[PDB]
Structure formats: C-alpha cells, structure tokens
Amino acid sequence: AAAALAAALAQAL
Secondary structure (H helix, E strand, O other): OHHHHHHHHHHHO
C-alpha cells in the first residue's frame, strides 16, 4: 500500500 498510496497522492497533487 505504501507504494500504491504514495503514487496516488503524487499524481493527485
């Protein structure tokens, strides 16, 4: 998840 979520955030912002 750490990977999944970090990327989620990066892209969102």
